[model samples]
Every structure is written in structure tokens, then in C-alpha cells.
Target: PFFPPLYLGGPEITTENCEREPIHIPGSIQPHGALLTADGHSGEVLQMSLNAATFLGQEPTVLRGQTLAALLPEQWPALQAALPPGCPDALQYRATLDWPAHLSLTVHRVGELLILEFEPTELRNAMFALESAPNLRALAEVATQTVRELTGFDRVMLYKFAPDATGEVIAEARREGLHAFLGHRFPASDIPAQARALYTRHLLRLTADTRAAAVPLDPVLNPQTNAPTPLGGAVLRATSPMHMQFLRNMGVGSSLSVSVVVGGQLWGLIACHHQTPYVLPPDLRTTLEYLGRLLSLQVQVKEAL
Candidate 1:
């Protein structure tokens, strides 16, 4: 009864359309980074980004059959030792470059497949400290402001989902030029059920540029799982084209968001938007995620009382 009926429907932005966006496999990845999946058991390459040579200096054709250990001789041991235990974890390793000093490699394992992500970092000034807040609004201010500076987004919003799954902009930190969104409410269809379901497992997401190029990963089906390897954490999952179109409608060029989860349920999101395309550094994403956890904790205490 909620969604408008479809009579002459070829395409529409209804709940069913957004909710069924695929997860068993994703189409491509955000162009700022390259991705690959390897056999977790044999350490052999399976599928990879088309732009691997540009970012990794290794041609994709040559890398396909080779093991990650052979390609990353010096860094492989350390990376292997720190493997994350679950599907929802992506280990952001230490910085691996000189000019892009914060650039690094990250990987997450899902069943027998291991997915790798690499992007050059463009970190600006950032600090890691939190001030105690008097109330939820105060806390939202701190959360929004910290991410605004940390990721260099012009507007940072604390969006809280209502009991019905609609959302409200509870607090905002934006540059003077931007229009205000604070205290405004948004439709539940804006996020959709699939989007919210993925948010529970992963705490952070970044969209550097809406029009960035996308390169498909080969061998679409995972041999062991007999299904496409889902980016369980969605750390580097490509944005659905429809979702990307929606962002452009809002005049957004780049974005980063962190999930605010409380008591094992998603409470809200720390949404950051920039007017120009901007890539998020792995280190910076980690910093924002840490604060997101803090904000959720403080809000939980208030909710309990």
C-alpha cells in the first residue's frame, strides 16, 4: 500500500527495485582503488580489477595464476599473520608508499575467497580525540564535526532512522555555502531494506566520485562457494548505479558514511558529503569508524536512561 502501483513499468525507483540490488556478486569497484579475490586455501589469484597494472604495477594477466605471496614477497608474511577471523573484517595494513604516504592494502576473507583493496591515500590534517558531551545533540555535533575535518567533507550530517525506518537529520556540520539539512526528515525508501541490512555488518562506506570508472572482476563465480563472492563487509563494494544517480541528484560528488550501531542494531549513520570528488584514506576511514563506535556508545547510555 505504501509504494505507488506500477502499470507501465519498465523502470521505477520503488522499494522492490532498490531492495533487490545484488549482493551474491557486485558489478565493479570504485575506481579510486583496485580489487582482487584469491583462493584462501591455495593463495592463488582468482579474479582482479582491470586497472591492476596502473595501481599495482603488475599486469592482471600475469597476476591471475600467481599467488599473492609470490607477488608480495616482503609484505605477505605480515599480512598473513594479521588475517581477520570473520567475513565482516577488513585488515588495513600499515602505509606502503612514500608520496601517497597513507596508501595501504586491505583484505577481507569470506569463506574460501580473499578480497583485496588498494588505494592511494590523500590524507590532510587530522586528530584523534573526543570531548565528553552533555547530551545526544552535543554528541552528534562532535561526531559530525570530527568527520567533517577528518575526511574533508564540506557537509557532515548525523542521520537518525526512526522506528518506521524513515530518517531525520538530527545534527549537521557544514560549510557556509551549503544548504542546511539539520532537523529535516527523509523517506525510508531513500535507504531501502538491502542497504540497511548491509550497514549492520559493516561500519563504514566511502564513495569517492559518483562518475568514477568501474572495472569488473573476472571469474564471476567463486569455485568453492559455488556462488559469487559477496563483499560481506562491502569495504570496497561498488555503488549501485541507481544509488549513484540519486547522489548526483543531491549535488554530491564524493561521500563517506559510518554506521552508528548500538546494542547490535543500527541506530543511525554519520553521513559526510563533499561538493567535489575526494578519495578517503584507509587510515582516515578507520579514525571515523572509531568515533562512530564512540558516538553509538554514548547514545546508548542516554537511551537506556
Candidate 2:
């Protein structure tokens, strides 16, 4: 029953210690997906998720020291070809390898380690012209509606962040009978500073099931770092347990959030909530990230005028 964290930061992040929560290095990830780390240069696997056996039929121990080529000899060279160069801090979608599970591959790097993420595959599709909307409010509504159609979440809200970092819901689309949130204001502390920074970097986040267990990294610490591996660039990075409790308080079983970043700053979020556990296919998250970019441009245009 006791899951002692591999790294120390806060004790059950709450209003008092929320700002101190080191969410970026949770030492675990959401159970909906799996993660692994390999040496960026030598290409030897450095770490693996405990749940890899559940998804890949390969235990973390069996997979740990193998090269990508050895893991999937047929696809290694092609995968290496698509890995984002310069070892960026942001996760990049590489390619889908039918490595027998139709896994979605995403890669990112930090301090000589390449973090690789895998989740179920595609459902990508989207686009709506800015000219179709009459004003910023309508555009936000359109954004919400578009998200509702693509994601089928119970509610989709486009909340704009104020200069003080508080959020105001600009538009909302939801299932009938769900309480409306348009014009609702949320405190800056609700998201906190470091969490917002993560939004701008990852762009989209999904918590498939708040009640599901978190899969811890196999070794707890990175082999080279001697510390819990940083998961800031991971797509399946675990949701903070405090945040999970927050979601449960609102009866939210699953959720997704798309960052509407502009000018390299935290702008706001197009947040979606579902009352039942929901898994967001990896490619669909990519589709929503594109919409976030579209929404950010609209935000800039309206603010400029």
C-alpha cells in the first residue's frame, strides 16, 4: 500500500505544497501507455517501464540492455531516421511501427538519454477556417465544438488565461445536462507555474483514467543519473496524484488538455473532461495539438486588433 516515491518533492501535493510538487519527475507514468529510455549515442536501452510486459510482451528486464535494432531488427534504421534531431526537449512523433501492436512511437531527449513513448495508434482528422467565425468568442466556440466532435469528451472548454495567470472559460461545448462553465474563472494556483511551463512544452496532455494505477519505472532511477528519470518530455507522464484527487472531486474520470501557446509563452488551455474512463489514441492527441496551434493564432489576431 505504500508507494514511496523514487524522488522526494512534496507529500501528496496540496494547496500548501502544490507549488513545490516536482510533477515533471514522477518516476511513473499513466498506465494507458508505456515509456522507455535508451542512450542517445550508444543506442543501448537504459530504462524501461514496469508495464512494458503487459503491452509489449517483453519484460523490462528482457528489454533493458538491448539496442533498438536488436529489439526490432527490421525497423531500427527507419526509426532512427525519423527521430527528431538536436535531441530536443519536446517529444516528437516518430513513426508507427506495426511492431505487432500498431504502437505509436514518440521520442524526445534529455541529458544523453532518449525517452521513447508508445501508445495505441491513429484517429487523426481536423481543420476549420478562421474566416468562418465572426469573432474571437465565436472562434473559441468553434474550437470547443470541433474538439467535442473529434474527442467526444463530455465537455470541451476553451479557457483563456489572464495577465495574472487565472483562467476564464471563453466558450464551452458539452453533453446535454452537464453544467456549463462559460465565463467561469479558475485560480492561477489551480495550474501552478511549473505545470503551465510543461503545457507550453508538451502542448497536449491526456489522463486516460484517473483511477487506474501508475506504472513505475523499472529501476526507479536512471542508470546514469542516479535519480528518478525526468519525464517532462514524456507523453504518458503520470498525472500528479493530487491532481487526480482534484479530478475525482469533480467526478471527472478522464480528461485531456491542449495548450494554446503563443509567442513561446503559456497562453491558455482547451480542456476536455469525460465522466468515464477514456483512452485518447496518440495520433488523435496530435490532431488536437494542431487545433491548439490554430486557436493560438486566432488568439493573437483578436488581441492584436
Candidate 3:
């Protein structure tokens, strides 16, 4: 049986062609992330992984043919107003919604698929790279090179967040299209006090995908004071709007924040940025999530000792 090749080797046609050398592509069969492709006309969701769904608080149930609007809650007046009207190639923005608790969602439109990067109201601390002994930094350097080579992101910094929310950049990697944002001291204001409190609560959270509404909590069987608990979905409104403003202050339009969990606690963050609006593919997003976990373990054994 002959399997005809599915090769299109052009810059515009393939995602790889658009990128340069040293791109971050995880070779592990268990890729750190997922690749979700939804039907364009039908609005049905398709091809999602369990890791991706775990981030969103659900399973990969078939969502083909259903409008994205149907999956979202009713409070996202802003997202409702701004989608599909933006552009053809892609459109990106940060949204905060009220399913009662504040949720933050970062959304991107690529062709017909709506790739969402979700986060809870919690503010992840600034995490850093470890380099105690020989080969440690080399390992980190290789990991970063892979990330830069893959994503084509300008500056990727490994941040170290103190228990109190203050952070510093320990490792830096740069690509040509972007500049270096390393070595700069990020103020305590980067991850404010209130948001840090939220981190002490949930382990992992996401707030991108404005069109999809957060799943609500029932009052009677609730976890806390018979009051509502924010189980899943984005409460963008509850997140610190000031953080968005601060990100703007740094001249970044799009960002990806992956949490590094150390010793069962919210450790720090892998802060990624794109000067223009750029969103990571679903598989890439999942990869970063796993990298975050890997980094977290490193921090625990290597740094937090």
C-alpha cells in the first residue's frame, strides 16, 4: 500500500515554514500539549486532548457543529461584540468575564479554529531557571533554545517568583523578530497582592477563549460556605485588570503565563510574550504546560532545596 505524501513546503502553507531554526518542538511521544482543530462552518469542536480539557475543567466531548456562542456563558458582552469581526488570519485579545467570579481568557483566531489559553483569576508568581551545578544551565539553555527555535518568540525569560509575588529573570533567550526583555527587575506590581491570594487556592487555571463561558457552580452542593465556587471557565472580570494595563505598559499585546508548581504550591511563571497579538497553537500551549510542570520539578529538587 502506498501512502501518498502530505507535504506542502512553502512559508505560507505550513506552520513550520513560517519559522526559523532552533524551533521548540518536543520530541517526546507524550507531547507536552495538544492540537485542536474545529470545523470552520459548523462551529463544532473537535480533536482536543485530555490535558487541554483538564485545564478547562471538562473532557474532550465532541463539540462539532455547535456554535461557540452556545458553549459560553451570557456575561461576556465584550467578547460577544468583538469576535469574527477582527481579521482573517488571526485576532487576539484578553478578556475578563463574570460568571460571578472574575475569570481571564486569552483567545486567538487561526483560520476557523478558536484556540483558547485559559487561566483562573489567580496570579502566578515569577519563576526562575535553576543553575546550581554544571550542565544545569546547559540543560536550561538547550530547553530555551528549543522554545525560541520553535515559537519564533522574541524574548523568553525564566522568572523566579518569591513566595510573596515579587519575581526576577534568571534565564534569557532571544529570537531575531523580537528584543531582549531579560535582566530587568519586574516590580512587585507585576503580580499584585490580591491576585497572589487566588494562587494559594486553585492549582491550575486558564482565562483565554472569551467566547466560551465558564461553567457555573450550584449553590446547594457547593464546596465553601454554601456559596458559589469557581470550578471552571474564565472569570476575566475577577482577574486584575491592572495586570493587563501593566502588560500594556511593557508594550506587549499578547502573552502566555504557565504556572510552575513546586512542592504542591504555586511556584512561579514562564512568562512569554509577543509584541503583536500572537497565540500559541493548542499543541504548543499543551507543551508549555508540561514544560511548566517539568520546570517546577526542577525548581523543587534543584533550587528550592
Best by lDDT: 2
| Cα-based lDDT for every prediction | 0.73, 0.80, 0.45
Q: In candidate 3, what are the lDDT values of residues 1-305, reduced to their tens digit?
A: 11111111212113222222111111101112232333333444543433445444455554433355566545234444454633533344566545334445565444444444454443022233333333535445544655565566666666667755678776678756655656566666556543444454332332232122223111112221232222222212222233445566776655556666666676666666666655455446545666666666776665533
In angstroms, give how far residue 301 of model 2 lies from its true place. 0.3
Candidate 1 stretches with Cα past 4 Å from truth are 1-16, 84-102, 122-131
Model 2 misplacement above 4 A? 1-6, 91-93, 99-101, 122-128
Model 3 regions lying over 4 Å from their true place: 1-136, 177-179, 200-239
Question: Which lDDT tens digits does candidate 2 get at residues 113-162?
Answer: 77888777752333544546768887787788888988888999988899
lDDT, candidate 1, 29-140, per-residue tens: 6777788788776678888788777787788888888997887677667666666445335444453644322446777777666778877765222222334566677777
TM-score on alpha carbons, each prediction: 0.87, 0.91, 0.46
Residue 112 CA error for candidate 3 (Å)? 32
lDDT-better candidate, 2 vs 3: 2
In model 3, where is the ten-residue run with the lowest total lDDT? 21-30
Report how far off residue 132 is in candidate 2 (Å). Answer: 2.6
**Residue 280's lDDT in candidate 1:** 71
Candidate 1 residue pairs in clash (backbone atoms < 3 Å): none
Give the candidate order by descending lDDT: 2, 1, 3
